[PDB]
């Protein structure tokens, strides 16, 4: 579990969005596994605006943050998980590291701020849904 709180937006994995998220929907994209809903309180996170490929992510299933190198966001085939069938996911970054289903929502961060959230796992990789292209998260 986990979210990004930027401005008056809450960014969550689409597959973990709640009814309240859907009832306050801003934007969602199944191919990216992302959903954004509106919030009443302003959030503490800053979105990275960069093309870093190194950062640190939180792994709930280890209670640890790990430094990783990761691929640039791409269209990637993802094997079946507990929450999606096998399918292509867009805007996905991969690193070598541990990720189970409940790790989804952990933040990946670089020197510029939040890069994305855990979205995929298995076979010794962790996949992160990028948010750095969503420039509108920083205004309105
Ligand atoms: C190929 S992909 O998975 O859609 N990722 C992607 C898409 C668009 C841009 C925007 N410059 C960058 C990366
Ligand atoms: C059958 S599967 O490989 O476990 N993948 C899967 C997981 C969850 C849903 C949603 N109920 C759909 C497909
Ligand atoms: Zn960066």
CA distance 55 to 123: 20
CA distance 76 to 89: 5
**2: how many CB neighbours lie within 10 A of its CB?**
17
For the chain, helix, strand, coil in percent to 5 are 15, 55, 35
Same domain? 115 vs 53: yes
Dist. CA 52 → ligand 3 center (Å): 4
Dist. CA 53 → ligand 2 center (Å): 30
Same domain? 28 vs 90: no
Nearest CA to ligand 2 atom 11: 83
Specify which residues 88 forms β-bridges with. Answer: 77
**Environment class of residue 85 by beta-carbon count within 10 Å: exposed (0-12), middle (13-18) or buried (19+)?**
exposed
> Comparing C-alpha atoms, which of 43, 32, 33 is closest to residue 10?
43
Domain span at 7: 3-44
**Residue 50 annotated as lining a ligand binding site:** yes
Q: What dihedral do alpha carbons 20, 101, 82, 70 form, nearest 10°?
A: 110
CA distance 37 to 26: 5
Q: What is the resolution of this structure in A?
A: 1.0
Nearest CA to ligand 1 atom 11: 133
Same domain? 34 vs 54: no
Q: How many domains does the chain have?
A: 2
């Amino acid at each position: 579990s986990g979210a990004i709180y930027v401005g008056n937006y809450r960014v969550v994995n689409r597959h973990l969005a709640t009814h309240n998220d859907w009832a306050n929907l801003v934007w969602e994209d199944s191919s990216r596994d992302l959903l954004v809903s509106s919030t009443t309180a302003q959030g503490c996170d800053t979105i990275a605006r960069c093309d870093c490929q190194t950062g640190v992510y939180y792994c709930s299933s280890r209670r640890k943050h790990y430094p990783v190198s990761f691929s640039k966001p791409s269209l990637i085939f993802v094997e079946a998980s507990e929450y999606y069938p096998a399918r292509y996911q867009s805007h996905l970054m991969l690193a070598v590291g541990h990720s189970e289903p409940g790790d989804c929502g952990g933040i990946l961060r670089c020197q510029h701020g939040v890069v994305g959230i855990v979205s995929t796992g298995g076979n010794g990789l962790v996949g992160f849904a990028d948010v750095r292209d969503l420039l509108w998260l920083d205004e309105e």
